[PDB]
Amino acid sequence: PIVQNLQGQMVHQAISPRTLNAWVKVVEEKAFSPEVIPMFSALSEGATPQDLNTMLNTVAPHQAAMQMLKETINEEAAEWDRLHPVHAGPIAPGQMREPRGSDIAGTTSTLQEQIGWMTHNPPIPVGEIYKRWIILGLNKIVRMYSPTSILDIRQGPKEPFRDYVDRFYKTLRAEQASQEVKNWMTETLLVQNANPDCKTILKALGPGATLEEMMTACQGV
Amino acid sequence: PIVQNLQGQMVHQAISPRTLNAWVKVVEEKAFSPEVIPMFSALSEGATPQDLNTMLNTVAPHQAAMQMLKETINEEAAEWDRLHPVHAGPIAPGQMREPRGSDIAGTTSTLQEQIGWMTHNPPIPVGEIYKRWIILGLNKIVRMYSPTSILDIRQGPKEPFRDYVDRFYKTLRAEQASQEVKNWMTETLLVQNANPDCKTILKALGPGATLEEMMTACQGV
Amino acid sequence: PIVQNLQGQMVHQAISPRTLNAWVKVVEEKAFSPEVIPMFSALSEGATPQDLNTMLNTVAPHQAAMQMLKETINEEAAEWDRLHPVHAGPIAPGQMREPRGSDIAGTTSTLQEQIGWMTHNPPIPVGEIYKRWIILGLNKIVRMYSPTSILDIRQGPKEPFRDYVDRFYKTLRAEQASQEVKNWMTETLLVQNANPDCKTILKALGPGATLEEMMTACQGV
Amino acid sequence: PIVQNLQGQMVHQAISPRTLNAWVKVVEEKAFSPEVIPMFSALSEGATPQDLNTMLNTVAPHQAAMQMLKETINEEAAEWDRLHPVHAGPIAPGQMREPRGSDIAGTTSTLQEQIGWMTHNPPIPVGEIYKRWIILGLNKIVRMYSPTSILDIRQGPKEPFRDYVDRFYKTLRAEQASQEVKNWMTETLLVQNANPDCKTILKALGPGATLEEMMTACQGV
């Protein structure tokens, strides 16, 4: 992250060892469950590209996930270079240069360059964009590691309705289908795969019933 | 680690008690699993040789692991002395002397010497090299304590494919074979030791199929 | 082969009918076992490219093996042409021209050309190189026809250790893995797949035990 | 071998392809049984060191046997060099030089040198000595590959006595014990391990009975 010294200047501060260890525990203990993404977003709050690469070093022992992340990052960097062509000409002495795709990811840039780029009026967030690319890669990884399809999430004969709903929505978040497909799933498949008693109640409830009404009507069933 | 005082001078800061306690919990509770190495790397982030020896004091009650670490450290120090002979002659007043193998490990050096050595332009990282030697020793220890061979990692009849892949790759990381041998293992043994249904599907998939394609084709099997 | 006439001149001699019949028996009766390669090497001893094509005519009824051989030969001829470019310019009257890839295989050359090329001071062996290409093709064929993986070679409960070792090494020769992979196989998999009594003895024997020591310790078990 | 041309000069003749194929069949089909040694002696009759190395090329795919052969050959060559020191001084123009250990094995010598060395009055057999070294190596290999100890050769309850004697003596030839130990074995162990009826008859026959008398007395038992 970025901190201010006693002289009022923006200075980079390294990630604390226990934050890095929390990230390591998340990587090594949760098997790339969907909750890894909110935890990564929280643990990398206000980070620099060098800090993000330090956090990514934890993923390196997982070859498939790391390769997927690297492919996503390279594609995003190529797209960034395509959409931000290197202008040929003079540059104002008071204005800093434009970083490239290899520079936002911190492959060739330095710490001071990123500190200056992030701290500006108006600021151009380089850490946030790299973080978003990491999140795209992580979403792909979570999709790859998902053990069950949404079509295989069925309510147990004695399973409470709220637990079935939680499992269903967790699997839906893992799968990351299209928005229209997701809406169709939440509207139709959730009712379709319920157990007979809750299914009868939900059918009696009618189409267009909100999730709150369904959980109310199926609370003790 | 190294911190800056109000006067702008680099000053050593001791490891916080809770970071040391986290390291103690890792040592005493995980039985030298492969995840001990990323956790040690995170918890010793930006540390000095004195801090590294403080962290190593936790390993001392484990006689075999500590002896293996000491052997690896002594061998690395001897190699460092061989590759960095003590030059006989004058030394510039503004340039500090060259530490020996017993000095990078902090056996004979002092805190100020290591602080000066690490904080330089350009810097010579003494903490990182000692840390790498520790990691070599820890890798040897993890290999020693591994309970199962990779040849004994077989998918259960009802075990999901992703869990089998995770166990297989964790054992592979523990064993630390040669790169060519590791590639052969990931290409052949993973398919060989799968359960009959996934094995049939993977055989139909053909050689050279990526891990993502295999996990996709075996998701619900 | 090449023989000398009464005048001291090198003359080509055709392969005897019974040598050709021995080669035919090898091709038609052994199902491309690994021993086909030493037998082909012995039976084609000191042969000319025309003789080698005569021997290859026996393989033609086997479409897959013959196609694999032709692909290997064409690739080797293309590589030979690439590494031996046709020089444009004068040629010494006493020095013969350089054969092409289609010429070493005897597709376009004549018998006298090959006789002169092989009989020279210093000699340039054209028959040996074509033979080596044939051996590469035959190795590929033997790999294709191998019925069992090395991972499936397991010592029987009452099988003598020497027979298990012979089967293991025959399969290893058939598979033709990389040298490092082969060393790992002979060091680890042979012990891993032995029966419980021999496995206990070999484990007690320790790593780095020679094959002779293992066969001595497991002789009557 | 060595043949004479029309001018009366000794000329080397290569081994015929079918003799080499017979040797290949012996190597690849008999699993280093004791009969491999008489067959090698017959098939290498009157051979040159180059011919012997050509025959040894068949053994190369068998790593353990080939390594044992190479160790025996190197030891014999070192002993030959020790017992035949290189004399420093003039050499007669009509007398050829003394080959070294690397020269009798054909590693550095040429065909003409060996032809001249073998064809002399009086002749110094270089092929025979190399052949004897090969036979020592092969005897070691046959000992290594022997599946049963002599102590485990026991006559079956209905096995004819002549077959038991043949198996016993074949195992004894494989084991190659000391002469006194071999005499003790043939005198005591053969009677000891016979079946009860033949054992009773042989005990009644008394010590010092010849093998012919034993086979006569046990013919139909």
Numbering used by the authors:
A (entry chain A), B (entry chain A), C (entry chain A), D (entry chain A): 1 to 221
Question: What does the article say, verbatim?
Answer:
To stabilize the 310 helix and thus favor the pentamer, we replaced the two glycines in the TVGG motif with alanine and proline. Crude modeling indicated that these two substitutions are compatible with the backbone configuration of the dipeptide in the pentamer state, but not the hexamer state. Indeed, incubation of CA-G60A G61P with IP6 induced assembly of small spheres of around 20 nm in diameter. Cryo-EM imaging indicated that the spheres are T = 1 particles, or icosahedra made of 12 pentamers and no hexamers. We solved the cryo-EM structures of these T = 1 capsids to 2.2 Å (CA-G60A G61P), 3.1 Å (CA-M66A), and 2.4 Å (CA-G60A G61P M66A). These confirmed that the mutant pentamers have the same structure as the WT pentamer, with the switch in the 310 helix configuration and the gate in the open configuration. CA-G60A G61P formed only aggregates, supporting the interpretation that the mutations locked the protein in its pentamer state. In accordance with our prediction, the CA-M66A, CA-G60A G61P and CA-G60A G61P M66A T = 1 particles were not stabilized by the FG peptide.
